[PDB]
């Protein structure tokens, strides 16, 4: 298992514009197009991201390309964030994938706000971190996904995804 397969399981794959769990227009493997309630706005953003007139529909290869760009951007964002980088660098490979999934889902600002859990992770207090991460709007809104990510930080194995 790796970060790509992990995220492909959590995000699914959809070739037509769809609304995500928060009701925002998205396409592909969780690629958020806009927070705007406007379908046309989402369609304009899609065409711009793909480089053609897609008419709200893309191919699998195009979805995979947006996904590659999005994973890369997510990791790079962590390395560029002063509150995140030190935590991420202290983690093992498995746990780093869990950090990346959270960032892909909620953005780096969002993750950088889990101050207390960040500290627990950095000190390798796994069970404690797991309990603190669950006290969040993130966990109450997407509990199955949050549980899988949380168990990954807690155990450092891919069991939740097998
Ligand atoms: Cl883009
Ligand atoms: Cl869920
Ligand atoms: Xe992190
Ligand atoms: Xe994190
Ligand atoms: Xe976190």
UniProtKB/Swiss-Prot annotation:
One of its GO terms (molecular function) is lysozyme activity. This is Endolysin. GO terms for biological process: cell wall macromolecule catabolic process; defense response to bacterium; peptidoglycan catabolic process; viral release from host cell by cytolysis. It catalyses: Hydrolysis of (1->4)-beta-linkages between N-acetylmuramic acid and N-acetyl-D-glucosamine residues in a peptidoglycan and between N-acetyl-D-glucosamine residues in chitodextrins. Changing residue 20 to E/Q: Loss of 99% of enzymatic activity. It comes from Enterobacteria phage T4. Optimum pH is 7.3. It is an enzyme of class 3 (hydrolase). Its main location: host cell. Keywords: Antimicrobial, Bacteriolytic enzyme, Cytolysis, Glycosidase, Host cell lysis by virus, Host cytoplasm, Hydrolase, Viral release from host cell. PANTHER family: T4-TYPE LYSOZYME 1-RELATED. Belongs to the glycosyl hydrolase 24 family. Changing residue 117 to V: 50-fold decrease in enzymatic activity. It is found in: Host cytoplasm. Changing residue 117 to I: 500-fold decrease in enzymatic activity. It holds the Pfam family Phage_lysozyme. Changing residue 132 to M/F: 2-fold decrease in enzymatic activity.
